């Protein structure tokens, strides 16, 4: 038998609680193509005035 309902009882019985968190575990919440094009933020520089290398 390959039916999940009866098998899930066996794997839970034989040492420790299972059911959730599978071996494969790549079904839901796996985002393909990452995200829409983002904008990377700038640090303490980039913005002009008082950006001398004498201070840095």
């Amino acid at each position: 038998a390959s039916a999940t309902r009866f098998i899930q009882w066996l794997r839970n019985w034989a040492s420790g609680r299972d059911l959730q968190a599978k071996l494969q575990l790549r079904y839901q919440e796996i985002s393909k193509r990452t995200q829409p094009p983002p904008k990377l933020p700038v640090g303490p520089s980039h913005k002009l005035s008082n950006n001398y290398y004498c201070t840095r």
Binding site: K47, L48, S49, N50
Partner: protein, 425 residues
């Protein structure tokens, strides 16, 4: 203590009728025989005792400046350079002191001839002035033919002849090294001032560069009393300087007012536009173009002096008035002045040829208002970088007024920036 109204006994008087014979009737070349007979210690000593400030747009005192070109012993013959070319836009001293009364400037060349020890004198006029150049040459033609300049000058051993040399539409005749290089034959670019000043090398000769208004004070100090020019004005600043009232005014006129005169009374004496300092938004410039714009809060209290104006963060050097109205745009006007510096920068110092030209392109964005609020704060640092590191003082002159857009202003700049950004986006 306060500055007198106009002064009845003024140095400049030629405005109505003077040609050649009229100069003798007015009060010129009167004690020319006595002044030439007197030694260099008596001539330069009288100028040092009077304490006449520099009439040109520099601020440097004349008393010390003439002393360097005394020349105890020299191989090369000494020359005299008189820069009569028009300075900053607003200052119209060149058009008035040369076209109306030319003999007053010619008297200074003879008085400064024996004092400096000059073999030949040069009068440098701007290329734009051709009608003024025709009057200046004709007065020199009448002077040479009479027998007062050349060979025997007023019964003295020193022989000095004045020669007029016309330029060609250049602002880079301002600096002492710039006017010397322009007459030399090479391109109109100023030599380095720290190693070789005016007294070291000018047309291969130890010379001295002086303004036409500064040269006009020399016969006034010699013929008339030295105390007469010294008493009128302030303790530090002395001598009646011709301040021309121009800009947004109902009656623009050049007046020969005394030193340390209040700006509120100066506009009232020449009749201004809307008001002396109440109705119109007061953004009047204490100088020609070099000086930063003075606010409405500090204008009536401040006096138009050579030293006192610099203490109020607005150093007046060119000695001219440029008043602005409430209706006229402040940002658009000064952006044109920076564009004037873009056309008239020589092109040597990289913080000026690639600095002021870059400053104009950023300022062109400020008129339309397509700039960030952070760009105002940045531009103030660039103007500080230009001011200190240049050959000539044009780099200074294109740095001071743009700093005047940061000081006292900025709500005017932010409102132009925020409204244009919201409308476009």
């Amino acid at each position: 203590s306060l500055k007198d109204e106009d002064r009845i006994f003024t140095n400049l008087y030629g405005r109505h009728d003077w040609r050649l014979k009229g100069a003798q009737s007015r009060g010129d070349w009167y004690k020319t025989k006595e002044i030439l007979l007197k030694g260099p210690d008596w001539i330069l000593g009288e100028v040092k005792t009077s304490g006449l400030r520099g009439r040109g747009g520099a601020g440097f005192p004349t008393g010390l400046k003439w002393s360097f070109m005394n020349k105890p012993s020299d191989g090369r013959p000494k020359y005299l350079v008189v820069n009569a070319d028009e300075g900053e836009p607003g200052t119209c001293k060149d058009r008035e002191i040369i076209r109306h009364d030319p003999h007053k400037l010619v008297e200074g060349c003879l008085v400064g001839g024996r004092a400096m020890g000059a073999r030949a004198a040069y009068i440098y006029i701007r290329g734009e002035f051709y009608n003024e150049a025709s009057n200046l040459q004709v007065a020199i033609r009448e002077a040479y033919e009479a027998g007062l300049i050349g060979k025997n000058a007023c019964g003295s051993g020193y022989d000095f002849d004045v020669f007029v040399v016309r330029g060609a539409g250049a602002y880079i005749c301002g600096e002492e090294t710039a006017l010397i290089e322009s007459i030399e034959g090479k391109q109109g670019k100023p030599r380095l001032k720290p190693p070789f000043p005016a007294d070291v090398g000018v047309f291969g000769c130890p010379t001295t560069v002086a303004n036409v208004e500064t040269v006009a004070v020399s016969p006034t100090i010699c013929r008339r009393g030295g105390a007469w020019f010294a008493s009128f004005g302030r303790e530090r600043n002395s001598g009646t300087k011709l301040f021309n009232i121009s800009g947004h005014v109902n009656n623009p006129c050049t007046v020969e007012e005394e030193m340390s005169v209040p700006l509120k009374e100066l506009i009232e004496k020449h009749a201004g536009g809307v008001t002396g300092g109440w109705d119109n938004l007061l953004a009047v410039i204490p100088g020609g173009s070099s000086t930063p714009l003075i606010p409405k809060s500090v204008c009536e209290t401040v006096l138009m002096d050579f030293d006192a104006l610099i203490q109020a963060q607005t150093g007046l050097g060119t000695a001219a008035v440029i008043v602005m109205d409430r209706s006229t745009d402040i940002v658009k006007a000064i952006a044109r002045l920076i564009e004037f510096y873009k056309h008239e920068s020589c092109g040597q110092c990289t913080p000026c040829r690639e600095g002021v030209d870059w400053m104009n392109k950023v300022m062109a964005r400020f008129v339309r208002g397509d700039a960030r609020p952070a760009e105002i704060d940045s531009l103030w640092e660039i103007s500080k970088q230009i001011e200190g590191h240049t050959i000539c003082a044009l780099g200074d002159g294109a740095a001071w007024p743009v700093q005047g857009l940061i000081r006292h202003f900025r709500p005017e700049l932010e409102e132009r920036m925020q409204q244009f950004a919201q409308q476009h986006q």
